Design a protein around this ligand. Structure first.
Ligand SMILES: NC(=O)C1=CN([C@@H]2O[C@H](COP(=O)(O)OP(=O)(O)OC[C@H]3O[C@@H](n4cnc5c(N)ncnc54)[C@H](OP(=O)(O)O)[C@@H]3O)[C@@H](O)[C@H]2O)C=CC1
Ligand SMILES: NC(=O)C1=CN([C@@H]2O[C@H](COP(=O)(O)OP(=O)(O)OC[C@H]3O[C@@H](n4cnc5c(N)ncnc54)[C@H](OP(=O)(O)O)[C@@H]3O)[C@@H](O)[C@H]2O)C=CC1
Ligand SMILES: NC(=O)C1=CN([C@@H]2O[C@H](COP(=O)(O)OP(=O)(O)OC[C@H]3O[C@@H](n4cnc5c(N)ncnc54)[C@H](OP(=O)(O)O)[C@@H]3O)[C@@H](O)[C@H]2O)C=CC1
Ligand SMILES: NC(=O)C1=CN([C@@H]2O[C@H](COP(=O)(O)OP(=O)(O)OC[C@H]3O[C@@H](n4cnc5c(N)ncnc54)[C@H](OP(=O)(O)O)[C@@H]3O)[C@@H](O)[C@H]2O)C=CC1
Lengths: 272, 272, 272, 272
């Protein structure tokens, strides 16, 4: 973009690395600091931010943190925990704020992130979608006013290769609702409906799961009464949803140096 | 309406009787012949077709077939099998064509209907919705062209008091698809998805069931490939869907005296 | 129901009167006080709350406020402004709290309601649906977090006899969003899309209108970004949605004697 | 894939070229013959079908028809008419069957294609989606049985950069319906609904248009009566929908040498 805040994207030729580029490129106030790749890297030294399209962007694919350690303000990581912990110690070193989307840390791993945060400002989250998060927060506002009367159902659709049912986002939805109602999902979820099964039990939260084709991800929570239904649905079209939120956080970091934050923090969901 | 074909509606103050009235009233070419009720009947003798609204319609609620046996052309029954078999023998008698929507006959019951039909023209079906039927027929046209590539899923929503999952209409959908593909539903249906369950198996037909509030009935069959999905959905808002189809059949009977027909017959689904 | 709070429903054989009955009947903590009708009334004196089904309920259709003025706690009115102003002065008189859903008052009319409220606790609103209202409130929470990035679209479907486009609920949605964004609907609404019309202008709020069959009312607001969309949809199935909210308000009145409140008040939407 | 029929994909590094690769790769019975690029081409000589992922595929990006003119059976073109007419004359020459998706020919252009077809088997269509086409064909089957009663509405959603409203696919839908009913779209379409506009006129076909974010393309035709609605919806997720159909046609060509065919031909839509 070119704008007050400067961004490096590690994992440059990766699935998210690509998107994180166009995002960075796109979002006002954030400008593409650096673009890293992995040594063996064929996109190395040059192939300068033209994964995201946009021909030429000025910035160039590197391999060294210190080779560029002054081209960027915030470090954006969607890599592997082993890279993460690398990037981590260098970020801490040079007071570089991070945005971490990498998953799969172990416990040792999280503590590190957590400790680094004493000296550096980090955004670490398991879901960078703004839609999802906003959605999880509206779900409890709706649950407080309707949760009691209504029949609450959760319907999710995913591609044919999704191996667990229901998804985690769905379970997360279930959980927000449940907690809004001072209930426990464990005592009211219903994951299947087959055969003869009496009338629906009040207070239950049932789950319906659709697995087909290439569906990136769709989630709907329904608040159904006699006479009406309220639905809040989230449809993900691409992994650009994750990228966008990472970048927004990157822009939000600008001006922090504190601790450990999440999308709630970025999104001020707590005062919504 | 007042129109070339004349219609009596038994069960006049019943759940369908009411609707069958407005329908009869509404549909061009069909005119409200008579409106029966049950002896004890408080709507008796008068309360003349003003369940359907329309103030006054000329026709009057009776109790006797022979008290009116010449006010109507086709007899419309959505009652109880015990009434049905009554109405039956009088219809046969006076060469009165019937439209039967009543359910729950036993085997003795169907044979009778079937036998009556040697002398009289009857429309007997378990689902009078035109939408449903049309839908079942488009489902096999779509299945023939896409059935092979696609992931076919069936999603149905019903009120909180529906006691079986999936519905019969859903199973019927499954069955049309399956037969279009020379398959057997029994070997490919999947009614639940809970927990860890590997990637979706090709050739399967999964079912997703939603039970909430007052939903009259919603059915969707999805044909999902990489890159796209075709959906065919049927939403029932009221039991007017059944009434409408009964009346249409009543109009179609006009000019038949043959056998036993169904909605396929009425709807010429076979040449669609 | 029989429960701590007691309710009279004027307009007893009217379109809402019927529903307001089943509601009153249904909702815990509210019990069917009285059921009024209009003098000429054929449901008079007896036909005791059996419009809502439930055979017999104990309460009996009357014609006189003072004939029953002590059978009920809160007065529920969905009538005509001319009845309203009647009911009004008697409610004020006997410190009877009201719930008014009647529409079409003139200015003289509202002032009266407003004045009555100095001495009596009234709930007066133009839309008693809880779903709608909750929905209008989630719309501005979503607008504050996403309103800026997203393309916000509003899609509404109504029966074939709806004569204005878009509906008022839709316009209301537009308006909540717009105000959340310190904008003015007037400068960004787009009600039609026909022919050649360049790319969508940022910051706009477009409206899409569907008019078909018997659709009671469906409203969807979409928050669309690159990569995802959040939808909040309200589907009305019956006019039971209005009835339910009226009764809930009736229960909420219990313990008030103050002024003039609305669904916001009943629903504590302000602290949501 | 490697399979009885052999395929060359011109435009190899283009938007469709990429997808046409994975498709070819994916579809049973079709095997990736050759992959062309344009002289200046950096993916030249090698970068062998690894745009579609799949690391290495054996086949290699070339520049010469005769450099490969015996590596493939059917020629797949989604290029520019100027390339098309090139590819054309060489296909004719070596009795190579074509699949053409390129758009924008002029009249001179179509005649050529049409003439080439006297000696060669070509599939030329403006929409290679199977879903769309199947859909257009189910639309007229539904229109014949319901078209008369129902209120038919067409709702389409597209990204924020779509410049005409409604889309061509939508207009095409309108047109199939209209012709099924021996009507003319021109006398019954309704493209906008704004302001005060009386009840919906019977026999009309209204259009509702949604323009937001990155929506690839969604189309729904609704058949709405009192009491129910049938919907047939097509959702495009990617341009893989076009690629898939091109390849299927490529496989269908196998064994033809005749004329000019379209997706109707490939899909046997005429006997469906
Ligand atoms: N938090 C969220 O909202 C979401 C998180 N993700 C997470 O983000 C990460 C990225 O996903 P994705 O893009 O699909 O994965 P990919 O396989 O696409 O790529 C990972 C990238 O990181 C690079 N890389 C891998 N290991 C290391 C390492 N040890 N040191 C340095 N660079 C490394 C890879 O380079 P190379 O292959 O060439 O070595 C590649 O560029 C994953 O952890 C994923 O789970 C994804 C979506 C959402
Ligand atoms: N085929 C289809 O598409 C559908 C069929 N139905 C079927 O149609 C029938 C009607 O349903 P519904 O209207 O809900 O039922 P209801 O309970 O509403 O009423 C049945 C009606 O039949 C009358 N009746 C009952 N028994 C007899 C009898 N022995 N002789 C004469 N009249 C009789 C009743 O009068 P009273 O109570 O006063 O004696 C009442 O008028 C049922 O069999 C139902 O399953 C419903 C929807 C769809
Ligand atoms: N605020 C909201 O959420 C909504 C409000 N409504 C409003 O509520 C009202 C009720 O609607 P609806 O039920 O359809 O209307 P209806 O025509 O169904 O009936 C009105 C009722 O009021 C009675 N009535 C009419 N005029 C008077 C009068 N002057 N004094 C006493 N009783 C009177 C009628 O009796 P009779 O005919 O026998 O004289 C009838 O019982 C309307 O104002 C409507 O706009 C409806 C839905 C929602
Ligand atoms: N029929 C259908 O269902 C659909 C058709 N299309 C049509 O297919 C075509 C492809 O679209 P798309 O992939 O987006 O376009 P692109 O811009 O992505 O690429 C066009 C491709 O053709 C190559 N090319 C362009 N001109 C010529 C030429 N004169 N001779 C040889 N090769 C040529 C380009 O190479 P280079 O840039 O390097 O020269 C590139 O590989 C378009 O006509 C499009 O309208 C797309 C979707 C659907």
């Amino acid at each position: 973009h070119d704008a007050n805040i400067r961004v490096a994207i590690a994992g440059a030729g990766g699935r998210m690395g690509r998107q994180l580029i166009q995002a960075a490129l796109a979002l006002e106030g954030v400008q593409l600091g650096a673009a890293l790749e992995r040594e063996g890297s064929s996109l190395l030294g040059s192939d300068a931010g033209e994964l995201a399209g946009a021909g030429k962007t000025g910035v160039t694919v590197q391999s060294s943190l210190d080779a560029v350690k002054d081209d960027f303000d915030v470090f954006i990581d969607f890599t592997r925990p082993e890279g993460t912990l690398n990037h981590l110690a260098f970020c801490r070193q040079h007071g570089k704020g991070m945005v971490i989307g990498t998953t799969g840390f172990d416990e040792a791993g999280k503590q590190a992130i957590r400790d680094a945060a004493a000296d550096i400002a980090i955004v670490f989250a398991a879901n960078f979608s703004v839609g999802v998060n906003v959605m999880l927060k509206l779900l409890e506002k709706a649950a407080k006013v309707m949760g009691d009367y209504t029949d609450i159902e959760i319907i999710e659709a995913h591609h044919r290769h999704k191996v667990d049912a229901p998804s985690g986002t769905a379970l997360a939805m279930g959980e927000a609702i449940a907690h809004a109602l001072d209930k426990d999902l464990k005592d009211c979820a219903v994951y299947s409906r087959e055969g003869h099964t009496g009338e629906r039990v009040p207070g239950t939260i049932g789950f319906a799961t659709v697995r087909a084709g290439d569906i990136v991800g769709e989630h709907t929570a329904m608040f159904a009464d006699i006479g009406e239904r309220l639905e809040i649905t989230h449809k993900a079209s691409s992994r650009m949803t994750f990228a966008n939120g990472a970048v927004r956080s990157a822009l939000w970091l600008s001006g922090k140096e504190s601790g450990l934050f999440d999308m709630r923090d970025v999104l001020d969901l707590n005062n919504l």
